[PDB]
Amino acid sequence: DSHQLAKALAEAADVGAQMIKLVGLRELSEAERQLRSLVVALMQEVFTEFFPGCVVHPFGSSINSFDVHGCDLDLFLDLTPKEEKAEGAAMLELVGSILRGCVPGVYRVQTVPSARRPVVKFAHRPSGLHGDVSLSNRLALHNSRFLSLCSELDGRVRPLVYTLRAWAQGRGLSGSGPLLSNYALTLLVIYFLQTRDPPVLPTVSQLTQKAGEGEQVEVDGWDCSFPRDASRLEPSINVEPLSSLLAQFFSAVSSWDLRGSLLSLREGQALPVAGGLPSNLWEGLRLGPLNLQDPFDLSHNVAANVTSRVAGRLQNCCRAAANYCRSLQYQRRSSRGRDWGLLPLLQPSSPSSLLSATPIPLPLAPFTQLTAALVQVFREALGCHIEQSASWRCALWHRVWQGRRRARRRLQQQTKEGGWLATEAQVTQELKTEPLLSFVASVSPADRMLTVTPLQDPQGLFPDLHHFLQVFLPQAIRHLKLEH
Ligand SMILES: O=c1ccn([C@@H]2O[C@H](COP(=O)(O)OP(=O)(O)OP(=O)(O)O)[C@@H](O)[C@H]2O)c(=O)[nH]1
Ligand SMILES: [Ba+2]
Ligand SMILES: [Cl-]
């Protein structure tokens, strides 16, 4: 791993071979699946001991075909409004005590009622496995099955999802908190496949319409019905190779309008967010920087946790990735030993690149006035020489991002013993023809955020400038807001 993987990808044919080989290397072995099966069997044994006729249904990465080594094990246990929450939480505690004290080998048991879907986190010691026990999740089962079904519908699915998933892990786009879940990212890939001119994957509404007799199922008032086998469905007429689909992915999601669009896997289409339509229809839908609808529960934005910085970082990383995929280093292999194809995409991100990818949130203000105030801050309040979404090229011959404290103290003392822009500009000018550091500033139409990328950085001081800008620019615009 990280060594064997690198040479394995570098050694093999074209890009598609790299993606396929990646899937081959990361996926769970037979022994791993045997181990997981046995552990789930034990859990089943103890839960049967407590709950006669209860079924333990594995879901998520286990059954959705996107599994990798050491992945979580998601288990679903199948057996007034605040009273119902309290009842559910108590029940969850009961399951938690069953895990904690009964089933042999399991430790690290933490009940999490506060989560969206309440869950009991567990670790099984002898197998070295960990995961979540869920009481109510029946939608995850069917949508996981839906994911594996997608994998069966077209052979390019697993390679795309695996590669893009690893890439997202690399670019810091995926994880907990504000980031994207692997499920959300997966839904994005699938939606991308549905939106190709020839469709690579059918829309979920098409699967629902196809369905079958007795294959009808309704969970939590939503229609989860899809065909059980991929044989009853006609293949894709899309001839696009893996690499082209990867590049097209990056370019696509880089060019999309995320804020103003709710991406529907059901209709296989982009539904306009503004104004008010989908949130009025399904009534449970949270809207934000990135909106991606679950194929079954239509009141659930799977990306609803994604902050503007994360969406911005996503589209930036995707634009950069597209730029790379247009280079010859991507398409053509290497003679001897050099990194080609998937390798720079799976390689760790440069600190300057990692920083530049994630934009800087700015206070609310009209685009024109915001831009004017920005270039006014760079020009006036900093030593920046600037020149002509919006963008400006900026040059700094000075250390201006650092040394401001001492200079401000000196000025404070000089003034003591004998309005923001002009004063801070004086602070800057009191800090003191080849450019020391040159960088690009960019503002997107929606949401309005400043993106700072490097150009010429001989001494490698760019990240310091980036952090300093992260602190300085918002408060500058903040003070400029109060002059009106
Ligand atoms: O918003 C969500 C998130 C997750 N889920 C359900 O939870 C399951 C967990 O989906 P994950 O986001 O955990 O991804 P994963 O398990 O496929 O991969 P790893 O995290 O193991 O790397 C998914 O398969 C989905 O069924 C939802 O239904 N909605
Ligand atoms: Ba998981
Ligand atoms: Cl597109």
Residue numbers in the entry: 145 to 223, 329 to 637, 763 to 792, 802 to 815, 826 to 877
Could you share sentences copied from the article?
After transcription, the 3′-end is oligo-uridylylated by a terminal uridylyltransferase, TUT1 (TUTase6)910, one of the members of the non-canonical nucleotidyltransferases. TUT1 is composed of N-terminal Zn-finger, RRM, palm, fingers and KA-1 domains. The C-terminal region of TUT1 is a previously unidentified RNA-binding domain, and it was named the KA-1 domain. Thus, the present structural and biochemical studies have demonstrated that TUT1 acts as a U6 snRNA-specific terminal uridylyltransferase.
The truncated TUT1 (TUT1_ΔN) was overexpressed in Escherichia coli, purified and crystallized. The form-I and -II crystals belong to the space groups P21212, and P21, respectively. The form-I TUT1_ΔN structure complexed with UTP (soaked in) was initially solved by the single isomorphous replacement with anomalous scattering (SIRAS) method, using the protein complexed with UTP in the presence of BaCl2. Subsequently, the structure was modelled and refined to an R factor of 24.6% (Rfree of 29.4%), using reflections up to 2.95 Å resolution. The nucleotide is located in the cleft between the palm and fingers domains.
